[PDB]
């Protein structure tokens, strides 16, 4: 009965990074992403992907709550996840929208 999410992040020429984060830590991950994404620290990335994503033990029962495509090189932002509060959409959407400042490419799953 576990719901995990797939957070894809690819900093400016840093290759695609698959960050697995529980649906519960989805909002948090995104909140911190909008911050780090606006930085120039390629080293802190590891500490971020590790601190957030454990990837130590995975199971089949674990379902996919949603995925988020984030690419700095092309400046693309896409969020597709379900099983979340209605009011939460406001915050999540706002954050994903702010990316427009450095990436007009913004898409969200209704």
Block residue for tokens 């674990």: 62
| Strand-by-strand arrangement of the 63-71 sheet | 17-22, 3-10, 63-71, 76-81, 105-108
66: alpha, beta or left? (left if phi > 0; alpha if psi -120 to 50): left
Q: Give residue 80's domain range.
A: 1-110
* Main-chain dihedrals φ then ψ at residue 41, nearest 5 degrees: -110, 105
Total number of domains constituting the chain: 1
Triad 29, 35, 39: Cα angle to 5°: 130
- Nearest Cα residue to 78 out of 66, 63, 86, 89: 66
- Cα 88 from Cα 74, distance rounded (Å): 27
- Cα 108 from Cα 57, distance rounded (Å): 29
- Please report, to the nearest 10 degrees, the dihedral formed by the alpha carbons of residues 13, 47, 76, 88 taken in order: 180
- Cα 15 from Cα 88, distance rounded (Å): 30
């Amino acid at each position: 009965m576990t719901l995990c999410a797939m957070y894809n992040i690819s900093m400016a020429g840093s290759h695609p990074t698959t960050i697995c984060v529980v649906m519960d830590r989805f909002l948090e991950s995104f909140s911190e992403l909008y911050d780090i994404i606006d930085e120039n620290d390629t080293d802190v990335m590891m500490d971020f992907i590790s601190r957030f994503a454990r990837t130590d033990e995975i199971m089949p029962e674990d379902k996919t709550v949603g995925f988020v495509v984030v690419n700095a090189d092309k400046k693309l932002m896409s969020v597709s996840f379900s099983d979340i509060d209605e009011n939460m959409k406001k915050v999540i959407k706002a954050t994903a929208e702010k990316f427009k400042n450095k990436g007009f490419k913004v898409e969200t799953d209704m």
